[PDB]
Nucleic acid binder design. Sequence first.
RNA 1: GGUUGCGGCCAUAUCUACCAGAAAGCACCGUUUCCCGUCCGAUCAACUGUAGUUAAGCUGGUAAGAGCCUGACCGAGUAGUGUAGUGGGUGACCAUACGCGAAACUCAGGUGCUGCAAUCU
RNA 2: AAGCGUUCAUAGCGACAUUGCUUUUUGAUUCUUCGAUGUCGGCUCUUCCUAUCAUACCGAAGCAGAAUUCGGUAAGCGUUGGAUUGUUCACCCACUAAUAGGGAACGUGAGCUGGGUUUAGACCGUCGUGAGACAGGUUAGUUUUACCCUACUGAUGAAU
RNA 3: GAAAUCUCCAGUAGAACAAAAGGGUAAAAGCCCCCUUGAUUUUGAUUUUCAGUGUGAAUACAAACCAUGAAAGUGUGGCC
RNA 4: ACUAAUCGAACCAUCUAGUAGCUGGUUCCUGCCGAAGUUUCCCUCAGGAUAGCAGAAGCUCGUAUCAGUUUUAUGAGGUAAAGCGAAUGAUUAGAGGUUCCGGGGUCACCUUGACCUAUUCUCAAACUUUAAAUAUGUAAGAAGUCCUUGUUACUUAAUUGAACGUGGACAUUUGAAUGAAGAGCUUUUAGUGGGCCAUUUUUGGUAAGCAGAACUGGCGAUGCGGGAUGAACCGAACGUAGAGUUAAGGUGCCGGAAUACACGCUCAUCAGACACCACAAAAGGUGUUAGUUCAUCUAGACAGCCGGACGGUGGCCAUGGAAGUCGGAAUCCGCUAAGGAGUGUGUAACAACUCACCGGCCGAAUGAACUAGCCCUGAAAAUGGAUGGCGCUCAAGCGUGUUACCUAUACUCUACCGUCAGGGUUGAUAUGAUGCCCUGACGAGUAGGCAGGCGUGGAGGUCAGUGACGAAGC
RNA 5: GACGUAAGUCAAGGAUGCUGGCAUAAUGGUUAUAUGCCGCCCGUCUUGAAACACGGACCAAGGAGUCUAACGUCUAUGCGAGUGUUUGGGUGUAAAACCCAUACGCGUAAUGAAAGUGAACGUAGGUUGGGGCCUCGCAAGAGGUGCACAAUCGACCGAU
RNA 6: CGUGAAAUUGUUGAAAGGGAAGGGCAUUUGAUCAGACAGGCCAGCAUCAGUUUUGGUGGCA
Lengths: 185, 172, 159, 58
Amino acid sequence: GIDHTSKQHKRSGHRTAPKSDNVYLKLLVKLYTFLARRTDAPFNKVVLKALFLSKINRPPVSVSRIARALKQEGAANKTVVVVGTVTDDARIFEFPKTTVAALRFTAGARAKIVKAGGECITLDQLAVRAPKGQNTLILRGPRNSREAVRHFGMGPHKGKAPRILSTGRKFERARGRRRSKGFKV
Amino acid sequence: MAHFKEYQVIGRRLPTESVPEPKLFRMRIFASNEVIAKSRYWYFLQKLHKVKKASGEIVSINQINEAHPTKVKNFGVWVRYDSRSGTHNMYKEIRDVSRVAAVETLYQDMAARHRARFRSIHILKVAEIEKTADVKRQYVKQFLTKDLKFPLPHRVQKSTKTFSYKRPSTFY
Amino acid sequence: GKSHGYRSRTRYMFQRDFRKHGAVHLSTYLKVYKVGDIVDIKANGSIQKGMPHKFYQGKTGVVYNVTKSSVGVIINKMVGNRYLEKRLNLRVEHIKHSKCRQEFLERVKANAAKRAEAKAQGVAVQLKRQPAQPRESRIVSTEGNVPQTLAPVPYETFI
Amino acid sequence: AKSKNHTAHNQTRKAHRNGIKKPKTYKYPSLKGVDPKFRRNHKHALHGTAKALAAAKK
RNA sequence: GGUUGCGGCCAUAUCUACCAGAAAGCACCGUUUCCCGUCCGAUCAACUGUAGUUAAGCUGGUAAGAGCCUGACCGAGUAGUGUAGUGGGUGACCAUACGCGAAACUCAGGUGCUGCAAUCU
RNA sequence: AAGCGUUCAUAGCGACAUUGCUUUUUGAUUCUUCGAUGUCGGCUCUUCCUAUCAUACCGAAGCAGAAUUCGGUAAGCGUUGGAUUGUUCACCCACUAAUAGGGAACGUGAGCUGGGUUUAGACCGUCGUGAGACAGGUUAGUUUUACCCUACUGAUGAAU
RNA sequence: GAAAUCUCCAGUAGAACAAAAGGGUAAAAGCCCCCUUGAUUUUGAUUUUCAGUGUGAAUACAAACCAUGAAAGUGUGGCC
RNA sequence: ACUAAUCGAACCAUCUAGUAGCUGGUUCCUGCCGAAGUUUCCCUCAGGAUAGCAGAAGCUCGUAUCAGUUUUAUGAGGUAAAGCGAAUGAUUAGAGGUUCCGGGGUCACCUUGACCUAUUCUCAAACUUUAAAUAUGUAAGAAGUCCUUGUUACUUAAUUGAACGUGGACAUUUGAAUGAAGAGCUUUUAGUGGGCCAUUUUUGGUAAGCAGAACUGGCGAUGCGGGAUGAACCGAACGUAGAGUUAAGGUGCCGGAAUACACGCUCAUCAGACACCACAAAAGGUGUUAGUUCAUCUAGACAGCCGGACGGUGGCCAUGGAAGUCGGAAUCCGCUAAGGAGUGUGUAACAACUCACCGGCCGAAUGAACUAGCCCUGAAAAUGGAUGGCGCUCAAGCGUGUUACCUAUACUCUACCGUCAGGGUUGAUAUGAUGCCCUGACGAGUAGGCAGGCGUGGAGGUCAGUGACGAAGC
RNA sequence: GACGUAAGUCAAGGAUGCUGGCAUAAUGGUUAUAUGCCGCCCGUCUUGAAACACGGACCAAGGAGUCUAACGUCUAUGCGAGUGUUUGGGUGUAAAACCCAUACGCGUAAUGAAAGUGAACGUAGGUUGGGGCCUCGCAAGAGGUGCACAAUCGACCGAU
RNA sequence: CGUGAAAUUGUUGAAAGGGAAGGGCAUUUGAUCAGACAGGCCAGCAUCAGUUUUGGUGGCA
Ligand SMILES: [Mg+2]
Ligand SMILES: [Mg+2]
Ligand SMILES: [Mg+2]
Ligand SMILES: [Mg+2]
Ligand SMILES: [Mg+2]
Ligand SMILES: [Mg+2]
Ligand SMILES: [Mg+2]
Ligand SMILES: [Mg+2]
Ligand SMILES: [Mg+2]
Ligand SMILES: [Mg+2]
Ligand SMILES: [Mg+2]
Ligand SMILES: [Mg+2]
Ligand SMILES: [Mg+2]
Ligand SMILES: [Mg+2]
Ligand SMILES: [Mg+2]
Ligand SMILES: [Mg+2]
Ligand SMILES: [Mg+2]
Ligand SMILES: [Mg+2]
Ligand SMILES: [Mg+2]
Ligand SMILES: [Mg+2]
Ligand SMILES: [Mg+2]
Ligand SMILES: [Mg+2]
Ligand SMILES: [Mg+2]
Ligand SMILES: [Mg+2]
Ligand SMILES: [Mg+2]
Ligand SMILES: [Mg+2]
Ligand SMILES: [Mg+2]
Ligand SMILES: [Mg+2]
Ligand SMILES: [Mg+2]
Ligand SMILES: [Mg+2]
Ligand SMILES: [Mg+2]
Ligand SMILES: [Mg+2]
Ligand SMILES: [Mg+2]
Ligand SMILES: [Mg+2]
Ligand SMILES: [Mg+2]
Ligand SMILES: [Mg+2]
Ligand SMILES: [Mg+2]
Ligand SMILES: [Mg+2]
Ligand SMILES: [Mg+2]
Ligand SMILES: [Mg+2]
Ligand SMILES: [Mg+2]
Ligand SMILES: [Mg+2]
Ligand SMILES: [Mg+2]
Ligand SMILES: [Mg+2]
Ligand SMILES: [Mg+2]
Ligand SMILES: [Mg+2]
């Protein structure tokens, strides 16, 4: 017998592969597995782990988010890398001429980047031209901005959204939510 | 609690700034080994002085061998022991060749005749009596008679074999 | 039935010390507290306002708020399987500086003094404290100290 | 039909299998419960020093 | 070093009895017009430091003093207590091993120290 | 062992205290049984225990004899017939050597009986407005099955 | 008079503080006198019970308006 | 009561698969993880919600904010103990002083009650001047330390402070030990919300295999070796095997392993061979053993049973009669190496038998009160029976000591299976990259969760699959 | 790594060498039996089941978490500030497949009971961290930039 | 009257049977049965490596 200090036979709790059965994503994982192992560049290990993520773990990255990151000092000429979907954003009116490598582009995002003078490439093209991720800038979309995150941590005084179907008056704006009706939160 | 040895254990309190070089007390301890010897020394030093193993030290451990191991002596052992209902002092008189063998005999004797374990025995003193007729017990005085002789009737002979063909004798 | 009032089971906790009743001396009122100070909580039974609950008797916390005649203290309280941050408003009569912070604040001062002295020469001057070490070997003499001690004493009735 | 009333048996074993956690301190704690007069002035103090570095570092 | 004012710790400072105290200060003391308060200038208020007294207050000393304070290989590593045994004992309980460890008791010593300002043969 | 016992604590007793045993009392518990172990008593029959009533042999006495009392070995052998009561318990008559105490699922209901409790009928007293209540009285009230296995009592029987 | 009013000495609280008990309090938290309404307005924060929900009770504030006092200060009901 | 074998509301059909917090059942395998009977609330107590325990999905990072542990430093507490010539409240006993309602007693009182003063015996869960042990809070640094000066409507008499800052300096001994198995964080949901047992603390109760708490360890949920037997005790927790070594317990035989060695104790006409545990007490015993204290004895001590049983004396009263022995009273020495107003047995009573006290005979140790080991008495229940059984007596019993030996699914080594983790592997990896391979660790499990697979009916595709030369079934 | 001057050898990152018999029931497997030791009847409720708790005489077949509306979390897929062809219409090899307009649902705006109002002082802010990237470095590191995310102080919108 | 299971039964054959029977580990005996000659089966010895056990003897403190 052994006085076990930790739980035995514990899985790491991290994805070692994508749950997706997309054959082309498996080829991207196959390419970046080799790069993460045959290079010491930390960029390849980050990209390989990002290729495993689920859909909510890779939120879309706006072209406006891409353009704001290119306003950083000394970042005006870097290859923006988005392991996920790059969406369009009409609220911006000045996009720069830069190169974006992404897993997926929307039709509007591809049009806006190309029209500005830039170029849209895939992750395998990124690997050929930047094997160690030279002059790259990984961008991640907002993960806690999901609508399900609103209801996480519900409870008194927590200030979270209740899980509700119909909103308005007569739907949870009474006893428990105001001092004139019993108590508040 | 094996074949006993006698130990010359000297210990003292830890010296302080106010009173360095303490009085450096010594005891004679019967114990199976030095680990028990130090433990017994601290135990008896708890009965006498305001000290303990944490606030003191042992400066010397020395085995004491019999000066004349192969001459038969009469020993007077004072002992204080706890019975089931009280503490008693008694005096035993032992005839053997060493203090360790006499003390071993008394531990066997007190366990056999009084059910007093080594746990509840305090060896007050082991002192050889130099002269005959200063001995007080008849069970040892009877062996100090002139030209002592005695037989051993009914000799029991051990047989390696499980069967014997002779129906043997107990002559001696 | 059962009674679980605010000051229940505090018959001896909130007693004053023997021959130490009466008015609180002025030292407690002249001590200056600041945010970040580490303070010990010990309620004064003579002062019934700003008085801590019986749980925080003997607890040590950090000052987060300084007020007119009171001090806000942060205490971590174990509820269930985790600790919870707690915030008390206590008058200065019920708190005092925990002296543990002052020796540590002198050790850091003495550490910097030793390091500054060691800067010019003599590196590795053992800034860290060490536990009590096993004693080194030494010689003990018997000049005036010849060992002499008796055996265990016999059992006397003493009554 | 009488039953057990109360026992803290197994309650410390249960509380320790997930390893009782300290409250995860941070730099810059919440100013909740701090004196409003100090807090009102600290808003004006932080605004001025933010302008001081802005005027100098630029 | 005495004394005064404001203090810190709050009897080593308290309490009882008896003695000393130059100088200064403090004090008792003298007075009732005004401000003020009373049954009562006793207290409280004001006025003159003048008519006086260290008698008291105050301060210090004296006491195999009470109390208090400090320390002790004084009691005592005792009572107690954490841990251990397929230890003892019918049991009540007890012993041992590895640790921690008192109170009363008995002795010895001591009887305020000190901060800021002012003042004094 | 303070006293009683004419004197004498212990022949026989025995205060004030105190140590036990038993599980035939009654309490206390709720572990088993609520897809049910037939809930009182008696009759019948066997066996067991000893804390022995008688009987055998003894020891002690405030044992002269007779009769008694105390104690030992001892459960081998016996311990009854009746009035009243459903009774267990009790009480009385009488005989006797003696009318001792208990256990065995408070032995024993596919052994019986069914007086009692304890369904449904009915009456009384008290209580309740009432329906009804009462370990209060009173009367009437279905007692099933073995042909299996074991056990027991008897009866055959292969193989040597 | 053991005692009805007056006087002095001792008195560490052996009294009193609405109501149980515990704690606390002596130029007071008790007694008497004077003034008074902070037992008021507007919110958040905190403690106990606790799920860190509610209710009750309480704590320190902030922004007002007041009470009292020479003043510092105290006061957001009852010494806790 | 009866109303078609149906009656305290018939029968038939439908609503109706009426509801059920209640009972029963709930169907393949393997792998990994793995509980709770507890918090709060509820017309709640056989239920549910809530928090906790558990699984799964993971996410952000990569050795840290850390820890069912210690040390150092600094707090807190009022239980164990202790105390009552310290407070409160109980409590025993006298002393000394004193004065009033207290004592008949001056008309100032040996033979008094309170009260005071100094002592004395004993106590407290709801007493306390003290006061542990165990447990418990905090701190031991880069979110740190120091220097200089910037903001503010706060604050100060006043940049005096407060808080947050600019700039500069400090480094692996960066500010104790040990460890760290990755660390932190989130979502979601199962089961559970009857508990019970053991040590220690502890309440009610005479007690209980009783009822109720605290901490911990267990059983439940768990097999294995041992306690014959047993949920909980001891030991040790479990993939499939081999070898070795052991734990607890044992080694006469059943039964593996010494009828081993050593010192003693015990003889039971109810021996003993009981950790939990399956019982025995007070009180006793010239049974036997060991010991404590006191006294006597070689100048011949205790006993053995040899001699003397003395003056007043037949001691006073009285007993029908008491003379050494009915009682009251007595107990003086005339004394001797030595004989009492006699230790007893006695007579009407004496008398007489016989002794403490003393020797012409001895010869070595003796006497008393006790202490505790074993054994014995105390010690009585019912079918025949249980140190487990047989049996065991310088033990095969009891106490103690020393070795050797036996064997658990435990430990060590190796193999094989699986799981987890960390890695390697692309210029033909000499084509399986969810593949091949290297390295290390790990494996119990109810309720429950997840994963990988097996099997059945039918459906799309494929094998131009099988088959009257035999399909399916059995 | 060892020995040896070296070649080379070795017990140095896991067994080789030599020899015999048989080549079949010989070893082995399966099965019946015997022997040694062990092994209580499953399921269930339960703190506790072999239980003197309950269901089960046997066998075959049938036999119990399904479907639907709405929804939470997570995952996969398409598109993405949009998304959803299938109410319908067109078409068809005809319940299939293919094509499509306008609406509508949800989302892109909140807040208040409501009347209403309605989201940039700033490089969409400041501070502390933060993977990755860039520059200088043999490296350790230093500096710059710092998405997601965590804490905090602000700013804006609605209510008061 | 397709096939034609099981429970249960008859006959035949085989086996075992002192108050159940059934089962687990291992082997004996009886029965029955699969594959391999271009190494298959069971063994013996020597020299080694790994893990152990049991001795003999040497030199030191
Ligand atoms: Mg209370
Ligand atoms: Mg108040
Ligand atoms: Mg319950
Ligand atoms: Mg005057
Ligand atoms: Mg019960
Ligand atoms: Mg029946
Ligand atoms: Mg008898
Ligand atoms: Mg019966
Ligand atoms: Mg019957
Ligand atoms: Mg019947
Ligand atoms: Mg009847
Ligand atoms: Mg029959
Ligand atoms: Mg019959
Ligand atoms: Mg009807
Ligand atoms: Mg149904
Ligand atoms: Mg129905
Ligand atoms: Mg596990
Ligand atoms: Mg979990
Ligand atoms: Mg207490
Ligand atoms: Mg006590
Ligand atoms: Mg107490
Ligand atoms: Mg339940
Ligand atoms: Mg259960
Ligand atoms: Mg047993
Ligand atoms: Mg067992
Ligand atoms: Mg143990
Ligand atoms: Mg065992
Ligand atoms: Mg044998
Ligand atoms: Mg045996
Ligand atoms: Mg498992
Ligand atoms: Mg079908
Ligand atoms: Mg066929
Ligand atoms: Mg068996
Ligand atoms: Mg049930
Ligand atoms: Mg039950
Ligand atoms: Mg069962
Ligand atoms: Mg049932
Ligand atoms: Mg049945
Ligand atoms: Mg059936
Ligand atoms: Mg079927
Ligand atoms: Mg279609
Ligand atoms: Mg809608
Ligand atoms: Mg047919
Ligand atoms: Mg058949
Ligand atoms: Mg068998
Ligand atoms: Mg065979």
